[PDB]
Design a protein around this ligand. Structure first.
Ligand SMILES: CCCCCCCCO[C@@H]1O[C@H](CO)[C@@H](O)[C@H](O)[C@H]1O
Ligand SMILES: CCCCCCCCO[C@@H]1O[C@H](CO)[C@@H](O)[C@H](O)[C@H]1O
Ligand SMILES: CCCCCCCCO[C@@H]1O[C@H](CO)[C@@H](O)[C@H](O)[C@H]1O
Ligand SMILES: CCCCCCCCO[C@@H]1O[C@H](CO)[C@@H](O)[C@H](O)[C@H]1O
Ligand SMILES: CNCCCN1c2ccccc2CCc2ccccc21
Ligand SMILES: CC(C)C[C@H](N)C(=O)O
Ligand SMILES: [Cl-]
Ligand code: NA
Ligand code: NA
Length: 509
């Protein structure tokens, strides 16, 4: 069994797991689209009532399972609840991270592609006034890279460069994962995190130096950090805030659990878990929130910045920011640093969502690390073609797996660990070996508050928001739904084979 060599490696690996594209690309959009400061209140509450408690729960379930040679939920859920059904529900712990990896790695490859082009200076050349004359060249740049449709058809035509970069991205992910936990994920985390931090701070510093006739970077911070209690009664903001919390902290993806399964039985998961969660939040609200938003508001003002965030989730990070940078000396290089930052941020997170499948193949099907990594890479690479060529396929996978799936799974793992397994056993398991104890009140939060909070959230969602996404979408969404449902059946079949394999082994022993 592989174990994290050092505590710093563990923290930086777990921090690398959480700190990713969600901090720098997703958070800014979610905040701006929901009133900025009006989004922060529910976000902070969601972090305290959902983020923190679930982080500890996943670290606990992981370490508990790893002690018995299991790093994924199909097996761990069964250990906590001896029921054939626990194995089915556990499949989501392999499905979610696999589906998310299918589109996450692709988006990650974009940042590598852009980074390369911006470094070499193969970027557009804007006409020397007029906002549209500045932004259009960059919009075209993105649209040509990923191949956005021009006609009436929902078909994408990625550039050859984009495709080749995706292959390289997969290769880089494999090169790290194939070396294992300590010599792969950990070695890399110790290099990537410090780099990521320096790049992020440098960018924040450069961004503040932005002052135009429309505003300053300070105006952006005020927008993001000014309370608006008139939206606290809006369910949509709460759904957005909770969704962001889950995504940014890697909760409900089965990633934290798998990583924690490599933590030694005696090791502290309380302080370690809290540190990883805190590092992510700092990287999100302080770093992530201080780059994109302040820069957009500085050049276009609050109103226009918000409109740009509402048009295309990728606008602000792949079109707007590099466009804004292009108007300053060394702006192309600054764009390179922005995309290089995103690449490392994503790379440290993509290896985390691919490890669960790898761990399952090693733990349950007894495959060698080499074979487990290559097969996982093959499944992701192949499946990724659907996201690369079918328009809005990405949007669909992100919803079922990265949005609904994670909240549902988060509630499932809590119920299984804190209700079925036992609230008092769970509590003991979480605190065992801890350098610090979990505050007493959190017992009540985990047992009553968190589950009730997520239960209400899921109910409202399925009533006033999801029916539209089941009756107001293009027919091609069914191609993606069909395929991801097939992935679930495939994983269920593997769980079944793992059962038959273990049974046969128990007879020979
Ligand atoms: C995975 C099973 C079959 C995959 C076939 C992939 C064929 C990719 O084909 C490539 O697509 C690129 C755009 O994405 C084009 O730019 C290339 O010219 C084209 O050769
Ligand atoms: C550097 C790591 C991967 C580099 C892949 C480069 C793929 C280049 O691909 C080429 O790009 C040219 C534009 O630059 C196009 O005009 C060509 O049609 C295209 O085939
Ligand atoms: C993902 C499920 C199916 C993916 C099918 C991808 C088929 C790619 O097909 C290729 O597309 C290229 C343009 O991108 C064309 O230039 C090639 O002639 C065509 O063969
Ligand atoms: C399914 C996910 C992506 C599918 C991309 C399909 C791109 C198809 O492209 C089409 O391929 C046909 C042959 O199959 C050709 O006869 C058409 O002329 C060509 O436009
Ligand atoms: C509305 N569709 C775009 C969905 C994808 N998306 C992702 C997903 C993974 C990593 C980054 C992002 C950045 C853009 C973004 C913003 C808000 C929700 C989802 C997303
Ligand atoms: C899916 C997770 C690994 C995503 C990561 N926590 C991020 O914020 O990008
Ligand atoms: Cl290109
Ligand atoms: Na994050
Ligand atoms: Na990361």
């Amino acid at each position: 069994r592989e174990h994290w060599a050092t505590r710093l490696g563990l923290i930086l690996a777990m921090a690398g797991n959480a700190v990713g594209l969600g901090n720098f690309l997703r958070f800014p959009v979610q905040a701006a689209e929901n009133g900025g400061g009006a989004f922060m209140i529910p976000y902070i509450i969601a972090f305290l009532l959902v983020g923190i408690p679930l982080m500890w729960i996943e670290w606990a379930m992981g370490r508990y399972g790893g002690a018995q040679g299991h790093g994924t939920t199909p097996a761990i859920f069964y250990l906590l609840w001896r029921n054939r059904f626990a194995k089915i529900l556990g499949v989501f712990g392999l499905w979610i991270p696999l589906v998310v990896a299918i589109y996450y790695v692709y988006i990650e490859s974009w940042t590598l592609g852009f980074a390369i082009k911006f470094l070499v200076g193969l970027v557009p050349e804007p006409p020397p006034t007029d906002p549209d004359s500045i932004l259009r060249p960059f919009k075209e740049f993105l649209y040509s890279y990923i191949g956005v449709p021009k006609g009436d058809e929902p078909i994408l035509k990625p550039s050859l460069f984009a495709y080749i970069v995706f292959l390289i991205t997969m290769f880089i992910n494999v090169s790290i994962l194939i070396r294992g936990i300590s010599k792969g994920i950990e070695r890399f985390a110790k290099i990537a995190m410090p780099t990521l931090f320096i790049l992020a701070v440098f960018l924040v510093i450069r961004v503040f130096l932005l002052e135009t006739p429309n505003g300053t970077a300070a105006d952006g911070l005020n927008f993001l950090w000014t309370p608006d209690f008139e939206k606290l009664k809006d369910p949509g903001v709460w759904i957005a805030a909770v969704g962001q919390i889950f995504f940014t902290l890697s909760l409900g993806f089965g990633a934290i659990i798998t990583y924690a399964s490599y933590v030694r039985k005696d090791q502290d998961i309380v302080l370690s878990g809290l540190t990883a969660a805190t590092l992510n939040e700092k990287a999100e609200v302080i770093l992530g929130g201080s780059i994109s938003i302040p820069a957009a508001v500085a050049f276009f003002g609050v109103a226009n910045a918000v409109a740009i965030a509402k048009a295309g989730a990728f606008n602000l990070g792949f079109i707007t920011l590099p466009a804004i940078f292009s108007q300053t000396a060394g702006g192309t290089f600054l764009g390179f640093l922005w995309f290089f930052l995103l690449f490392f941020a994503g790379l440290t997170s993509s290896i985390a969502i691919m490890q669960p499948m790898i761990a399952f193949l090693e733990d349950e099907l007894k495959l060698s690390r080499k074979h487990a990594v290559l097969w996982t890479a093959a499944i992701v690479f192949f499946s990724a073609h659907l996201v690369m060529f079918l328009n809005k396929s990405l949007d669909e996978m992100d919803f079922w797996a990265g949005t609904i799936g994670v909240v549902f799974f988060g509630l499932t793992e809590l119920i299984i660990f804190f209700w079925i397994f036992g609230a008092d056993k769970a509590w003991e398991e979480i605190n065992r070996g801890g350098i610090i104890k979990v505050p007493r009140i959190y017992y009540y939060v985990m047992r009553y508050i968190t589950p009730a909070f997520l239960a209400v959230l899921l109910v409202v969602w399925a009533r006033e928001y999801i029916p539209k996404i089941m009756e107001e979408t293009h027919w091609t969404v069914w191609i993606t739904r069909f395929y991801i449902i097939g992935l679930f059946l495939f994983l269920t079949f593997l769980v079944f084979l793992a059962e038959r394999r273990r049974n046969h082994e128990s007879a020979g022993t």
